[model samples]
Target: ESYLSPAQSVKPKINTEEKLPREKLNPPTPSIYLESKRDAFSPVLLQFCTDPRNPITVIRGLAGSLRLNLGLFSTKTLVEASGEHTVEVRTQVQQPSDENWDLTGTRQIWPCESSRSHTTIAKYAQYQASSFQESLQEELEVLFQHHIIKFGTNIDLSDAKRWKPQLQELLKLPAFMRVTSTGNMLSHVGHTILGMNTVQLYMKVPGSRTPGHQENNNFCSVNINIGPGDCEWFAVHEHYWETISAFCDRHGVDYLTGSWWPILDDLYASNIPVYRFVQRPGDLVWINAGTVHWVQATGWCNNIAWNVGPLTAYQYQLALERYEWNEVKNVKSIVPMIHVSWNVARTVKISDPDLFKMIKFCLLQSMKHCQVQRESLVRAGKKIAYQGRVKDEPAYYCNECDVEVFNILFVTSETYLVHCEGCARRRSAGLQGVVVLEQYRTEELAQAYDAFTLAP
Candidate 1:
């Protein structure tokens, strides 16, 4: 049986419909790094992996600020975009080697600086920080319980004061990455699998695939460079990816603007407004949903990154509603963010059961929403019509992204409520009233808040 195959065959209901080994739907979890040989993890390379640059454009070069002691090698590794350096391959005459005898040395290897040394990132450029600025994260309930966390609002990524500013454990030191030789990436996926108001830690080898906004305004992400000198970044406006995605969709070019717009084009070029600059090492850069960006590695570098998103139901609902069209496939509900948050609420709920201000007294409401989506997909997987509010209609309306019509739509009264392929796929991710977020504003606002207003 295939993961997406619900129609291949169906067994009569065993008290339910059909689904996957995992409840929430998504592609495989993205692990962008790998061990090419031993413990050393390297970037996965993508061929034709670069955007063409202007031939006449002259970009300046920065002197090699860092150094390496490669015995036969003459220079240290350095990566640049439109800068004044190209990688080179050199061979010395040792002996009349048969491998080169029959072959002409006419084939030139692409220019970029890459060298392997016995050392790993001390002598090597990329590595985890000697130690965390703080300590490792411990049990969530014990630590975050006393505080009354609030979310479901707008804030800038740069405004450190906006969210919980100094939680160092949120950092994921040494998130691996690369230059031309590389693998693709994980968007700030930390939001879903983790909790809302969740900040994440991204360890990249300097450069990485571009980034995004998520789960609404209740969250924001910050990336701190652990490099030597400085690092550069380019972020196209937030709406760009989806905007161009829609345009590309019409021509089957949705693949182009798939991430944050015109991706196949110049990595640094775009129609939307862009913010490109150099951030010094140790600089902690926060980002919002409005500006989607890409990072640059001057040779090999490293950083720790993470997000500070929503924790309360209001913020979760806010981010959930704004989830993009295909975002569902990228997220996970096997354990939604709130599942963890709810635990904290539960431990205290016994003492403050009606303290709606704490759990907000909406656990049931949130849980039901989750069931609606999971069950809807189960039925759809079987190609069975949903026994829902719109059952009489030829099709069903999803409660979240609405990309597909399902077998059922949860109805409370005269109105019918449902999640589209978006929310259903995510297994009910959230914020206040589960309002759609700004980044996810692509969907019309009319049906955005279609959920039962009960406690989960």
Candidate 2:
């Protein structure tokens, strides 16, 4: 008997039929009412709303009212544009007896062995854009009654500019076009898997939810609901994050990269403020850097969200703090903060005093750490080899624990494997025979620090 390989056995059925027309759709009543649509699109309003001190904000009355020109993205049209592209879907199941959704029981349907097409996912979404209430209610019942639902999230659409030309209209939006407003730090670096400066999509059916998590690499995220449907969002400010983290730890919960949905009663009793809102179609939601938040798709819809690394001192401070915390917790930082800090110092001439001070501090600390370590290794009679980074080469992660190893790397002499400082020490059992690879020369780093300090 012949057995089919896993890749060959899995086949997704895709359909591209248009069940509803964009013109026939009636927009839902605005969630948050405002006197004028101008307030929602104001550049000043965006700056204030995205401040780290502020909570998550949803500006309504932009879908049917303002002509942002996103109507061409109906479900069928979305499938037509990027249907064949594969996506990773998160699967969550609720037992028949359990009336409430539980976050601990969810699993991921990875696209590696069993992949799905965006076209195939559209079938499950099955929404009549005109009637949101009737369709969502039916789907919710099915999900709660012993059913499993899939949420396709983080679908990278950065290349959409080439495939879908109309995406230019989206780029021309106030949020994307601004300079100081959302000065993207990763804009200069080409697109990496992190999607920090790239556009990604969230396509899900009713009852699909994204478990609680911070933005990638602590970068602030801007999300817009482009749909005939809406979404529900809950967020806690960065100030109360430690408190919430402690509570989750007490209950034997391991958030594991920020994925815990706290009990509402706990938040209320603990005097923690939770920003809860419904994001209607054409509404933009701004999540400040390092804010602990989670979202759920109340109706079948699509959301386009991307990260922005602001140039402000507040944003850089938060990102660098998180980078250190990740190291202490033994979790890998998505964006290598140390590496990017040096790069920014070398390239951009800073005008903001606070931002300049923060970058300078990071660069000095990293330089000092590297110099001290290299001197100690040299004193011990260890061989040092220089291996400069190639163009567009990625930061190295420890082969053992997966933490990003910065300027210094420890390579085993026997196996020729790389490991971070702590992991390398444990492997050696306090013995020697590991090779040292230096990514940056000490003098070169000091020169970058001097240049940054001397700039106008």
Candidate 3:
């Protein structure tokens, strides 16, 4: 006798209504709309690749460890001849040269000769891949923890003080490529992934007071990577670049010279026969091995792209070793003022007119707020500091004009808040001023305390 086909062999169905609550229950009904919506967004095969910018200087070591941890070089192929096939791939790291490193450890599956067997494999593969992916993720987490201990000690916190001052100088840097409101500053510290050229910095001043505050104060900030015309601000300054540079320099590694941003744009935009990659924010672009990217701007309030760098596993390991010694030796220095000025000038030359106007407005507003902050500090009997040669020099004195320029910039826009370095210093120093009537319950204060308050 011939056996029935898998589809034809129907087993008796048992009701599991007794396994769950029956009171106030309804039978499940499939919704075609929901299924269709889910199907539209879901792809049959999905691939998650490593971040292309991972190999750059700032993130070099971390990226290397991540690539290794994720086992990106390992190949895990899934093939489905017919019906629905689900593939879940994940990364894992094992002992060097270990053959059992694959997610399924070399397990292979053959297509079923019958439809029933095919359906079984399809369903089983889904569950198996899901379990394998989960295990891979767990392994990745363990590797990350191990790498953190190896690399985290390489960061240098001593340079944190230089961040604010260096940013202030970046604003005054000259722009080569002129734009309305944006410009860039580039640098090529030895052994960088990219040569570092043609990137621009964007600056803006405060207009009206920030929301939730009653005082008529202005604030200023800058934008980077998005060019002068774009209004988005992403990425923020961190220890990534400084750490990577110090790590590489100490390790005696030859850094890769990645292409510059301006050059990349020009090459990508041009119809030239050459093939080069053009990168933009949110794009999965690679920085090539040994490249570094840096951003600096003044009055910047939102998150800004600080820098990008790429490196390989060998380079990463070497840097990690050097990082420990470099951190202890304290070898990182501020990027030179001349370099910043040159890049800013280049950016200004290529920026749009409207963006340029916006930048100027931002600068002026920042200057104005700086003046107000100065006055407020003086009225409160607090000492103000300046980046001048002598202690007696006026904070706003412009040596270029041969005249004392006080409150030269004014706020005309409402996009940001304007606070001066002096105000920031005061806040840092933990100096508190009188609680104004608008900000707090000033009327309930004792008469003695009122004398100490400044009238807003």
Candidate 4:
């Protein structure tokens, strides 16, 4: 705390006599570049900023000609809300919550059960923010790297004035928040934004919720430091998970299940392009969804961040498929997510045949996922109560595979689960012997296929 100081303003002088060429700093990709507020605010630019992609872009000078005071965000507000702090909130559902999830209505500050323990992610219980800390690296305790750029160096915010917000006020502001080690905003609904339904990657700030942040999808996390001039900025952005994973597998940074905090340097060193930049107050930086990035802050700074979701069909499928793959055994929950991702395609539905086909395909996949769950229930030795008719959605899911059921299957006996179609198959086929009580009937699955019929 002592090292943190008040952010000071800087003055820019024009050298009209000799128009010196400005030195350019490179970002993650050749496509990555900075935009002025005018261009950034333009519809084209705004669309591009939020367009679905695996990219990191920077937009400088968002506060406009009258640079808001860098101090507007009190240090108290620079307060990153991560860690294990919990609050209570609510999620919403469509049309009074008929089928999907009933809990999503409207809500407030609430802690997610997912945020507790060495849960959700493994950073605490012996973790630090820096990817390059001393004892951590030796422990092979690497964590997911977050990318950042110091504002002062990239933009001219010398004339900026104070635009401070209290910690609580900052928490309330609808902006991308700086990632919190404190987990302070864990209770906010926005923390669970995608809710397994509409998804994209992710981001955060002091504390709050807006569609609860991506519980299912990833996001292009963007953060802009306002008014902070001249400071040390550390970031590593070679964040292709599979690629990073492969590289780490070869190097020492392979933290498949461990906190990806400690052992990131190996990937950082192995030719990973890091788009390290010094940010000025009001400078903006965009991190691609699913991009692995890390940051080290070295001075007083105020930042606002936003995690953008996918837009196009290609983007949506890519994000959703990737999200599905990331669904490991430990952190799966059904409280509420973008259940079925129906909303993503809702916009063009009843209109776009391709989109209709996509939903139909997804429905089929969901059935496969559910059936896989059904098989697991039979093998688990738990007395399965099968409900064949589609009169109602199944109340229970395969503990191992998490797929919901209507041609329902459940074992009353205690069978700890890690649900998924794949897990059930492997368990049933590999473990041998299976038993299931069945009086199943289906008058609905066929009907569902009927609904799939569309008029051209």
Per-model TM-score on C-alpha atoms:
0.33, 0.76, 0.20, 0.47
Listed per model in order, the count of residue pairs whose N, CA or C atoms clash below 3 Å is 59, 0, 58, 91
lDDT of 3 by residue, 172-199 (tens): 3122111112312222221221112212
The worst-scoring run of ten residues by lDDT in candidate 1 lies at 49-58
Candidate 1 segments exceeding 4 Å error = 1-219, 236-241, 247-271, 289-291, 311-318, 322-335, 338-341, 344-364, 367-456
Error (Å) of candidate 2 at residue 279 is: 1.0
Question: Scored by CA lDDT, what does every candidate get?
Answer: 0.30, 0.64, 0.24, 0.36
Measured on C-alpha atoms, candidate 3 has an lDDT of: 0.24
State the local distance difference test value for candidate 4. 0.36
Better of 3 and 4 by lDDT: 4
C-alpha positional error of residue 200 in candidate 1 after TM-score superposition, expressed in Å: 8.2
lDDT tens per residue, model 1, 1-456: 111112321111221133323212211211112222222222222111110110001011101111111111111222111112211211112111111111244532112112212322222212222222122344444588611111111111221333222332222222221100111011223222232233332223323323222322323444545455355655443334465445445545323223222332332233333454565554445444223444444323344444444232322332333332234444323223233234334332222222233233234444444445555545644232223222122223344543323223332222545554445436534211322211112122113222212245
What candidate 4 gets wrong by more than 4 Å, as runs, is 1-43, 50-54, 64-72, 76-217, 226-240, 256-272, 302-306, 327-338, 343-360, 368-456
